[PDB]
Design a protein around this ligand. Structure first.
Ligand SMILES: *[C@H](O)[C@H](C[C@@H]1CCNC1=O)NC(=O)[C@H](CC(C)C)NC(=O)OCc1ccccc1
Ligand SMILES: *[C@H](O)[C@H](C[C@@H]1CCNC1=O)NC(=O)[C@H](CC(C)C)NC(=O)OCc1ccccc1
Ligand SMILES: [Cl-]
Ligand SMILES: [Cl-]
Ligand SMILES: [Cl-]
Ligand SMILES: [Cl-]
Ligand SMILES: [Cl-]
Ligand SMILES: [Cl-]
Ligand SMILES: [Mg+2]
Ligand SMILES: [Mg+2]
Lengths: 302, 302
């Protein structure tokens, strides 16, 4: 038993991380088959950061302007192109360590593992959720751009995030592997601000089921509620309304514990209204909304 | 910027995990050079779990009683021996994926990455601290035994934990790679109970410095205190006394922020006495003691 924020083993992704240099600018890239993906701000000139012309800047560059480093070995760049906010660098050598992989765009509330990297070498791995305001709360310094977020099913890697930038509030923004930003942000240093965020109601319920499964049950009541009744409380405490599909994906967790989704909603309701009586749930003194229903089934069934 | 519980990339350890079967009993092993380490309770007969004679049980077993599986490939067992609570299985084939590695015994308060495994295949990675009561708060089910805890420096893996058992309170116990238990526990199903735990004062201070470095500073006061004054408060709130060596290893963090160790102690003091005013520090509503001084320097300096 026990419940901890848990990342996926990063080995299959570590064997795809390379370093990308264009000029003075260095960051990470993702070497899959004969191609290396990295953020397109790797070609920005120092003062042309406020509003860079990426089309103009990219046609200026040869294959020779891009150094692609994979240890103490230089991969050969034989083509430079752009898709949305990601460069693609064709190389003559395919990645012998290439795994079965898809590219996927995830939804707010959904989690992925981040492999934080600097100068091409993996540094640490941690779990993130895409917030409703389309940012993540990660940990990222200068050199971290090109770090990816991913999920693993069987032997297939689902890559869903590439790191680009830090917003004033200390939160992070990036795109999918097609180079499209999550949220309303752009890859220029123009003033941008994370919108107002909300609590991922379905994920809080999932985590309360994780509690019950691990014997943390002090907060369970036997009060009735309804979807409409619960949503009136949700809205008041800055929680997303619970939808019927949200109810449906908590079906597994409801089946295993014998506690109807709406019984757990009446428990979450009393927690919102009365607080936690200076107690913890799974060692947290607040309600955790960064674990999906899937995350709980996966970790409470190995 | 940003601060998250962060594990080490698990790739170098993933390439050492194998499956070990003796009879009906299966669990993980650690294939380094020509040897496979696993917990010695892998040879326990079903009813001989209360007080197993491990010396008697092990001499009963051939090399042929131990199936060692590394994918869809069976490694050849050419010798069975025991060191404390770990079996060692000699194999004819050395691990081609073997990395530069030490075995180390860590101290209470110190952190490591866990690679949770089932039937030899890595499942997830997370960060743990050895508690003062010599348990860890991990996440572990049937089949997880043989999962290891590790640290990485340069290209060298420091393996410091192997998983053995779950205590009644939902907390976990294991040994070092020499097979010696952390804490007063034994690898038999006799009644054992985690002692009383305490808060790792040096790690809370480290994490408060992590806060200040990431701009979370509402809790900083300008009150004076002394080591003796602080320890009187520490003792009252079930914190370990701060020692001069604890003061010394916070030197890096004190240098970088301009805040003397004892100034931060006066801040931790007021937090203990007055609480957190329903606020968070780095997104936690309680004081986190699972990050070492080293963990903070490493993550706030990439
Ligand atoms: C990529 O390595 C780098 C990582 C950032 C900086 C430190 N922590 C991170 O996550 N990305 C950037 O530095 C980014 C570059 C632009 C070309 C996108 N700039 C940035 O993060 O700050 C931009 C900003 C300025 C003013 C308001 C809003 C955003
Ligand atoms: C190894 O795979 C297994 C994993 C445990 C069980 C579920 N979660 C875990 O972490 N280890 C054991 O099952 C262990 C076996 C003994 C031979 C050490 N037994 C156990 O964990 O419970 C023992 C116990 C009983 C009564 C009081 C105190 C401890
Ligand atoms: Cl694809
Ligand atoms: Cl590392
Ligand atoms: Cl994590
Ligand atoms: Cl050694
Ligand atoms: Cl996996
Ligand atoms: Cl973690
Ligand atoms: Mg183009
Ligand atoms: Mg022996």
């Amino acid at each position: 038993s026990g419940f901890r924020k848990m990342a996926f083993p990063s080995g299959k992704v570590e064997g795809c991380m390379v370093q990308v240099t264009c000029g003075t600018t260095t960051l990470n890239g993702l070497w899959l088959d004969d191609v290396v993906y990295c953020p397109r701000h790797v070609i920005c000139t120092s003062e042309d950061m406020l509003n860079p012309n990426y089309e103009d800047l990219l046609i200026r560059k040869s294959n020779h302007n891009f150094l692609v480093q994979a240890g103490n070995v230089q991969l050969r760049v034989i083509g430079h192109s752009m898709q949305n906010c990601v460069l693609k660098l064709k190389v003559d050598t395919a990645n012998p360590k290439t795994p079965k992989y898809k590219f996927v765009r995830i939804q707010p509330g959904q989690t992925f593992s981040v492999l934080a990297c600097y100068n091409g070498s993996p540094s640490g791995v941690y779990q993130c959720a895409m917030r409703p305001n389309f940012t993540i709360k990660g940990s990222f310094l200068n050199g971290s751009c090109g770090s990816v977020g991913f999920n693993i099913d069987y032997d297939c890697v689902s890559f869903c995030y590439m790191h680009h930038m830090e917003l004033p509030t200390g939160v992070h923004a990036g795109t999918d592997l097609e180079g499209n930003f999550y949220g309303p942000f752009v890859d220029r240093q123009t003033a941008q601000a994370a919108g107002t965020d909300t609590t991922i109601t379905v994920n809080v319920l999932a985590w309360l089921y994780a509690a019950v499964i691990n014997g943390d049950r002090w907060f369970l009541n036997r009060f009735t509620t309804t979807l409409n009744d619960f949503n009136l409380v949700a809205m008041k405490y800055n929680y997303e309304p619970l939808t019927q599909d949200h109810v449906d994906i908590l079906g597994p967790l409801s089946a295993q514990t014998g506690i109807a989704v709406l019984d757990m909603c009446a428990s979450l309701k009393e927690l919102l209204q009365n607080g936690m009586n200076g107690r913890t749930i799974l060692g947290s003194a607040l309600l955790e909304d960064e674990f999906t229903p899937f995350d709980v089934v996966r970790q409470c069934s190995g």
